[PDB]
């Protein structure tokens, strides 16, 4: 089925196509593929618009291909599309953050462009569909409707004007690619991404090579609009989703477990036959006076290695997107760079980290399972190491990152109140990889008021060697299930 077909056979039942060709509402807004998915879903849910699976997919794809955003228009807000768990969401000012980011992310707003009249219709949609909106906290404290008309609508119109849709990707992304990235909780990886065009989609296989092993996933993907790549792949009973941006023949983005989007990894991929280019090096740190194995991922790297003063070593292997080095740093801690195949490789020499932090340092986990239809939502943590830097600055905007370090993980009550409730006892547990698994959902008769296995927790990580005074904490809210969720939160 084609988009034009669904527009005329389903959408036209209510949406008027003006004499100029443009459609009422439809041609007065631009948004991401996820955005269009949500709008079409509402037409089906709220207005009884009957759509077969093929029609639904066709219209959403058509809208993404003709009325989407450019990749630049998504800058600073891609976290919401990637379902990135380590993120921060806010509006341009207190007024917009409180008014438009108190239910769903403000990113949902920032990833749209509309005419002034349409932004007006959108605000009317909100108070019309959610009449108690003006009675809720942050709304009943002001003349919500008056302010919406005089300040919010004009702000949206002025800040996110319609503009023009970008041209759709028009090349053939088929071929073999080399990739590199990392998965919080497991580590760094290299690999391959192979695309094979099939009609308007692509057959896709992604292979992830970690230090301890490899695994491949196969499925289907497609490029939406200017450069939004979306794909679903599987291996056995495991299914993952790829949310990448494709620009200049290079993929970048995040992939995640289809059943638990908090679990996933980030990567970049370029054509395997490309000129010398470094994607990443793992590890990116060198423990002074200790020979270590380093995997430099990239294309056409070869074995021409030029090392600086404080580092000596050699190339152990090369080819297939990875050149393995054997290096040893000597001297004072700090940034160190070398060249391989004419490309710069940045590392960091150190004897011991000045401190470690927990990423994320504030997050949630959600109870689930227990016979219910909503699965638990875990929380992944990683202990990051740092170097004070030149100005000492134990924890400021100039520190040097050392990367994730293996560590011992533990949970405990955040404060006295949580301890009285024994939250740490019923809220769940964290394993040796920093993965926190929440408890069963539903009222727990063992707790006071038969309350849920929710909890106000603290996550503590402890790393290794030299001076060994490395510990960091994170604030974790083991909270309740969410019954409403969407492509864009």
């Amino acid at each position: 089925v084609t988009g034009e077909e669904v527009l005329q056979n389903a959408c036209a039942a209510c949406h008027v196509q003006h004499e100029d060709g443009r459609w009422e509402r439809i041609d007065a807004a631009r948004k991401t593929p996820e955005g269009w998915d949500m709008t079409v879903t509402r037409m089906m849910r709220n207005h009884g618009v009957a759509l077969e699976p093929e029609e639904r997919a066709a219209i959403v794809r058509h809208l993404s291909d003709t009325r989407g955003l450019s990749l630049a228009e998504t800058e600073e807000r891609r976290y919401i599309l990637e379902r990135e768990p380590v993120a921060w969401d806010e509006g341009p000012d207190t007024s917009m953050t409180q008014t438009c980011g108190r239910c769903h992310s403000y990113a949902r707003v920032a990833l749209q462009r509309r005419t002034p009249e349409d932004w007006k219709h959108l605000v009317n949609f909100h108070l019309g569909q959610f009449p108690t909106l003006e009675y809720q906290a942050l709304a009943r404290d002001r003349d919500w409707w008056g302010i919406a008309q005089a300040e919010i609508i004009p702000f949206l119109a002025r800040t996110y004007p319609l503009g023009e849709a970008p041209d759709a990707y028009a090349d053939d992304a088929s071929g073999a690619y080399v990739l590199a990235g990392r998965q919080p909780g497991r580590g760094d990886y290299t690999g391959r991404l192979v695309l094979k065009k099939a009609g308007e989609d692509y057959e896709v296989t992604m292979t992830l090579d970690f230090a301890d092993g490899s695994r491949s996933f196969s499925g289907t993907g497609r490029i939406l609009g200017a450069g939004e790549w979306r794909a679903t792949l599987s291996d056995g009973t495991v299914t993952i989703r790829q949310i990448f941006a494709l620009q200049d023949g290079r993929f970048s983005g995040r992939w995640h477990d289809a059943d638990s989007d908090v679990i996933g990894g980030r990567l970049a991929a370029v054509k395997a036959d490309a000129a010398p280019q470094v994607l990443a090096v793992a590890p990116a740190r060198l423990k002074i006076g200790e020979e270590t194995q380093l995997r430099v991922a990239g294309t056409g790297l070869g074995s021409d290695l030029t090392l600086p003063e404080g580092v000596a070593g050699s190339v152990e292997s090369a080819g297939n997107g990875v050149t393995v080095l054997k290096l040893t740093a000597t001297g004072t801690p700090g940034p160190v760079s070398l060249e391989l195949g004419g490309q710069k490789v940045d590392l960091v020499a150190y004897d011991r980290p000045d401190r470690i932090s927990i990423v994320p340092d504030l997050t949630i986990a959600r109870i689930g399972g227990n016979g219910g239809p909503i699965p638990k939502v875990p929380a992944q943590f990683e202990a990051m190491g740092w170097l004070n830097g030149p100005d000492g600055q134990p924890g400021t905007g100039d520190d040097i990152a050392l990367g994730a370090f293996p560590a011992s993980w533990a949970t405990d009550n955040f404060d006295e109140e949580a301890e009285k409730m024994q939250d740490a006892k019923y809220a769940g547990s964290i394993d040796d990889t920093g993965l926190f698994t929440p408890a069963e959902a539903g009222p727990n008769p063992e707790r006071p008021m038969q309350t849920n296995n929710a909890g106000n927790l603290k996550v503590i990580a402890t790393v290794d060697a030299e001076g060994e005074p490395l510990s960091a904490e994170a604030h974790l809210y083991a909270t309740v299930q969410r019954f409403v969720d969407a492509p864009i939160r």
């Binding site: 919401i80 906290a137 989703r241 059943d259 109140e417 727990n444 929710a454 409403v484």
Partner: protein
């Protein structure tokens, strides 16, 4: 909680977290505040609003403490 992406910041008493930055002021148990949130669609981005969008969401679960397992997520479970 700008860091708690996807959670609500309207604390009446809230859904993911309460006004005191904890979870003890949320309904005890959550099931006791579930319909108070659902029926007037107080947190439509987190709990199904039966006032307009999902009128039949709680059908068959009148005894929320006993039948909470019947309540479904309205998101087909995807990315």
């Amino acid at each position: 909680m700008n860091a708690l992406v996807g959670c609500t910041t309207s604390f009446d008493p809230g859904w993911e977290v309460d006004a005191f930055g904890a979870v003890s002021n949320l309904c005890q148990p959550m099931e006791a505040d579930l319909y108070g949130c659902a029926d007037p669609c107080w947190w439509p981005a987190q709990v199904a609003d039966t006032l307009n969008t999902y009128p039949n969401w709680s059908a068959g679960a009148d005894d929320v403490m006993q039948d909470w397992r019947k309540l479904q997520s309205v998101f087909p479970e995807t990315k």
